[PDB]
């Protein structure tokens, strides 16, 4: 139905939130770094991106930075552990949409998702 790019260098998690949002009945897309993030947003124009924080090489505030660039409208909704408080700031005073702490509720998930992207 509607395209989510879900990001994380963590296959576990990259998984996990896989499973929550095809259940949701989505359409979803995975990569494990920036570059795959990149690329993947620039083909596919996803209606949502789900970002982890830190991911190896290009973290997520520097992916934020290049998809809020090339497409300010997409919703970026950052995952986050609960003591990157200085990150959260940064990346919500640079236009996410959201953020969610670790460890993920499912129901908060959904639920946001499901209000940024689906009327
Ligand atoms: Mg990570």
Do not use: C, W
Not at 7 to 28: H, P
Not at 72 to 86: I, K, Q
Request: proline content about 4%.
């Amino acid at each position: 139905m509607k395209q989510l790019l879900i990001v994380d260098d963590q296959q576990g998690i990259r998984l996990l939130l896989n499973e929550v949002f095809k259940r949701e009945g989505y359409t979803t897309f995975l990569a494990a770094n920036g570059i795959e993030a990149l690329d993947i947003a620039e083909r596919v124009k996803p209606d949502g991106v789900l970002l982890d924080m830190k991911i190896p090489g290009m973290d997520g505030i520097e992916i934020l930075k290049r998809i809020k660039t090339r497409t300010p409208d997409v919703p970026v909704l950052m995952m986050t552990a609960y003591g990157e408080l200085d990150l959260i700031k940064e990346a919500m005073d640079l236009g996410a949409s959201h953020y969610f702490t670790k460890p993920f509720d499912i129901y908060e998930l959904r639920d946001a998702v499901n209000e940024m992207l689906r009327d």
